[PDB]
Amino acid sequence: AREFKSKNFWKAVLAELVGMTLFIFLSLSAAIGNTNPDQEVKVSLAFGLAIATLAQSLGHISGAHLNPAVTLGMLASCQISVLKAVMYIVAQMLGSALASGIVYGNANLGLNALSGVTPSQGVGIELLATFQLVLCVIAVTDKRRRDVTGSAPLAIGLSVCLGHLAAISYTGCGINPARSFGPALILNNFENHWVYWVGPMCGGVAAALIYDFLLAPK
Amino acid sequence: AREFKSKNFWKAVLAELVGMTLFIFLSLSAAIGNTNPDQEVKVSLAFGLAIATLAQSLGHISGAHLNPAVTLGMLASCQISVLKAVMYIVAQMLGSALASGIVYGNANLGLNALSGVTPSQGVGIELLATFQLVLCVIAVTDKRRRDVTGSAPLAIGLSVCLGHLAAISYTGCGINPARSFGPALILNNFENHWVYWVGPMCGGVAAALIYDFLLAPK
Amino acid sequence: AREFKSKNFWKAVLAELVGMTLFIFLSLSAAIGNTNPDQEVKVSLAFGLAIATLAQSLGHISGAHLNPAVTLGMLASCQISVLKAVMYIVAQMLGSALASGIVYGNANLGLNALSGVTPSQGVGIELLATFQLVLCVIAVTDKRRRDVTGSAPLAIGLSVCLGHLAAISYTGCGINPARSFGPALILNNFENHWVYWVGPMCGGVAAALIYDFLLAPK
Amino acid sequence: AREFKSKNFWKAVLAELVGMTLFIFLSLSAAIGNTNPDQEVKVSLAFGLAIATLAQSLGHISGAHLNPAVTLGMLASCQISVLKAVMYIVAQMLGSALASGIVYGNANLGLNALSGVTPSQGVGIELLATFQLVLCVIAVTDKRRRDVTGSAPLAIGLSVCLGHLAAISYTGCGINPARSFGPALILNNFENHWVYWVGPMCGGVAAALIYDFLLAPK
Known part of the structure; x- marks a missing residue:
């Protein structure tokens, strides 16, 4: 039964849309809340617990990527088709734009922005902070392992959360191009937006290649 | 052995009363403690760790719903009888009113209240913030799964905790009609109280229908 | 091989001494650190992560009670001998006094003290905040269960941590008579000290009786 | 196949280099971020979640020691060869120096420094705060156990995180000689640096001896 015609495939795409819409609604609500060094841990926790909760809730349905950089890492890791990667990323961008429009209707941590770093510094920070995330996803979901006894969604x-604690005071922490894209589109502010695509996507592919080709090869 | 006449049933109802009384006593104690943007993470953590701890302690006895919206989601998911849902919600409301009376004897995060949102905005925020909670409960307790290797109570x-981080600065975060009801009754302040019933109950039913009828169907 | 003459027994007593000394050294160091509403989450986390870490490290050796109220609950639950309870509590008091003397050599959250509550209010707060702790210990270690898939030490x-978030702004949060005893002895300040014995010990026994005789009977 | 000539060995050494570089880049980024009592929980969480995430990601490849004191404890515990300990510590020091150079290019929590304690007090604080860490690593990875049902990397x-909450306001919390070494080398400030070697290494060896020779003997 071809993937494009498969009920399980489109349920998985729907889980990504649903999960992304909730991820961004809840996290942006915390980030805009009710200045910005005070919010850093709260926001970091909100984004991390949002992913922990939605991956626990949906991961068995779609994988709960909720993140184009995770999806691209899985594609580079040959774990998903090109069709799945495209549809997941479309669903992630749509869900993020939908949530952003709800929450919103500059200023705060909703919109990723560089803070005291240049664009090329921001690209490197986003790359390393996404690299560690996609390395964790790939490693903790590696089907060869028998030693992942705790919660993979929580990890x-x-x-x-860690990526936020590291990057939030420099780039606002995107590590997730669809998460950056929603508020950019809604606020019509694409300043430095390419940073939040180039960094995380390179980091996600780099994580798949380093895990799979060097560290724990097939 | 009919449910109404069953010892295990009434032990489960008692666990809900006991667990709800402790949940609200401990969480309200933290929320009233010893202004309100400073408390947000502390309160969010107190409510979330209270549920994590009591669900770990009682979940094998009653399910540790401790929440009419979770109970209604389980009923919509056909996992509990109507009799169980009624008695659980009565036990939850009673335990919350009892705890509230102990803790108390406006002002703070004890009493859920709208803050800078309209009632219909508050209903939508409560709905989405409860939706993600009941989706998580239903998904993480789904008996078909074999992949929930970590702590379901902690998830x-x-x-x-996540629902609080998202909603607390807008609605005070109810996501739990009995949790809202206790302080409302004790403080005799039912202003906007219907928000904290309509939102969470619709969210809980919506979560059961979306999980069970769309995403991971039977 | 009689318990008093058994190598495993005295290794377990030694684990309690060692674990208690580290628990109090690390937690008091955080609590005295470098005013007191600002510290509440930090201190709450330090005590909770100290117990999570030492129970993960020693729980298979002694049970890692590290708490006379947990030990008394286990005795009321008929899971340890009277001899074990006595020696554990002596080891816990000694370890706490030793750690307190190291850390120290009023003022702060090192010494449990009532803050804006009467002694009888403090007894009830300590009782409920210990009750939920010992209920969790007993429930999560219940050998009949097969559903504790996550970390029992972390729970x-x-x-x-939860008990601190609830009680710290009222009583300083003892929920552990040996933890209260160390700084009291070192500071020679036993004001209201009986609160921190009566409350937690009644709470621990109450938790064993309610779990074992009512909720999940043998 | 001799260890020095083995592909798996050098993959493990590479994992330590990679994991250490990410651990220090992410943690130092949080610690320098964007005064120091306000940062304590954020920094404590960043270092602890960095180790939790990288140990979850790499632990099956190298053990994810990421810490000369953990490595020396494993050597004292006879779980790794002398060759492995040397190469791991070289990889850890190199990764930390590399990350430090990236992040940096006094002042803050990047550079471990004594704060209101003497060098010999700092040595004892670093020893106890490392002791509890290496005790946890050794205990939670003990292959004889069958009861570690949660996440060992998270523990x-x-x-x-706990070690930071305890030690950060006194020594800045090293508990990891390579973590101390990187910023010291990059900032060319080795003031009190021996504290951050002597304390943690003695603590790590002490943890192996106490676990293995006294508490849970072979």
């Missing part, structure tokens, strides 16, 4: 969520 | 507690 | 540590 | 990360 991924806490890696999202 | 649910962290989802409670 | 207990997070319950310790 | 170790939370122990790292």
Whole structure:
């Protein structure tokens, strides 16, 4: 039964849309909330617990990538088809834009922005902070392992939290191109937006290649 | 042995009363503690760790719903009888009113209240923030799964924490009609109280229908 | 081989001494650190992560009670001998006094003290905040269960954290008579000290009786 | 196949280099971020979640020691060869120096420094705060156990977090000689640096001896 014609495939695409819409609605709500060094841990926790909770809730349905950089890492890791990667990323961008429009209707941590770093510094920070996330996703979901006895969704969520703690005061922490894209589109502010695509996507592919080709090869 | 006449049933109802009384006593104690943007993470953590701990302690006895919206989601998911849902919700409301009376004897995060949102905005925020909670409960307790290797009680507690991080600065975060009801009754302040019933109950039913009828169908 | 003459017994007593000394050294170091509403989450986390870590490290050797109220609950639950309970509590008091003397050599959260509550209010707060802890310990270690798939040490540590979030602004949060005793002895300040014995010990026994005689009977 | 000539050995050494570089890049980024009592929980969480995430990601490849004191404890515990300990520590020092150079290019929590304690007090604080970490690593990875049902990487990360909560306001919390070494080398400031070697290494060896020779003997 071909993937494009398969009920399970489109349920998985729907889970990604649903999960992304909730991820961005909840996280942006925390980030805009009710200045910005005070919010850093709260926001970091909100994004990380949002991913932990939605991956626990949907991961068995779609994988709960909720992140084009995770999806691209899985594609580079040959774990998903090109069709799945395209549809997941479309669903992620749509869900993020939908959530952003709800939450919103500059200023705060909703919109990723560089803070005291240049664009090329921001690209490197986003790359390393996404690299560690996609490395964790790939490693903790590696079907060869028998030693992942705790919660894989929680490990991924806490890696999202970690990426925020590291990057939020420099780039606002995107590590997720669809998460950056939603508020950019809604606010019609694409300043430095390419940083939040180039960095995370290179980091996600780099994580798949380093895990799979060097560290724990097939 | 009919449910109404069953010892295990009434032990489960008692666990819900006991667990709800402790959940609200401990969480309200943290929320009233010893202004309100400073408390947000502390309160969010207190409610989430309270649910994580009591679900770990009682979940094998009653399911540790401790939440009419979770109970209604389980009923919509056909996992509990109508009799169980009624008695659980009565036990939850009673436990919350009892705890509230102990803790108390406006002002703070004890009493859910709208803050800078309209009632219909508050209903939508409560709905989405409860939806993600009941989706997590239903998904993480789904008996078909074999992949929930970590702590299901902790996942649910962290989802409670997440719901607070998202909603607390807008609605005070109810996501739990009995949790809202206790302080409302004790303080005799039912202003906007219907928000904290309509939102969470619709969210809980919506979560059961979306999980069970669309995403991971039977 | 009689318990008093058994090598495993005295290794377990030694684990309790060692674990208690580290628990109090690390937690008091955080609590005295470098005013007190600002510290509440930090201190709450330090005590809870200290118990989570030491129970993960020693729980298979002694049970890692590290708490006379847990030990008394286990005795009321008929899971340890009277001899073990006595020696554990002596080891816990000694370890706490030793650690306190190291850390120290009023003022702060090192010494449990009532803050804006009467002694009888403090007894009830300590009782409920210990009750939920010992209920969690007993429930999560219940050998009949097969559903505790996550970390039992982490669940207990997070319950310790929860008890702090609830009680710290009222009583300083003892929920552990040996933890209260060390700084009291070192500071020679036993004001209201009986609160921190009566409350937690009644709570621990109450938790064993309610779990074992009512909720999940043998 | 001799260890020095083995592909798996050098993949493990590479994992340590990679994991250490990410651990220090991410943690130092959080610690320098964007004064120092405000940062304590954020920094404590960043270091602990960094270890939790990288140990979850790499632990099956190298053990994810990421810490000369853990490596020396494993050597004292006879779980790794002398060759492995040397190469791991070289890889850890190199990765930390590399990351430090990236992040940096006094002042803050990047560079471990004594704060209101003497060098010999700092040595004892570093020793106890490392002791509890290496005790946790050794205990939670003990292959004889069957009761470690949760996440071992998360337990170790939370122990790292705990060590920070205890030690950060006194020594900046090294508990990891390569983590101290990187910023010292990059900033060319080795003031009190021996504290951050002597304390943690003695603590790590002490943890192996106490676990293995006293508490849970072979």
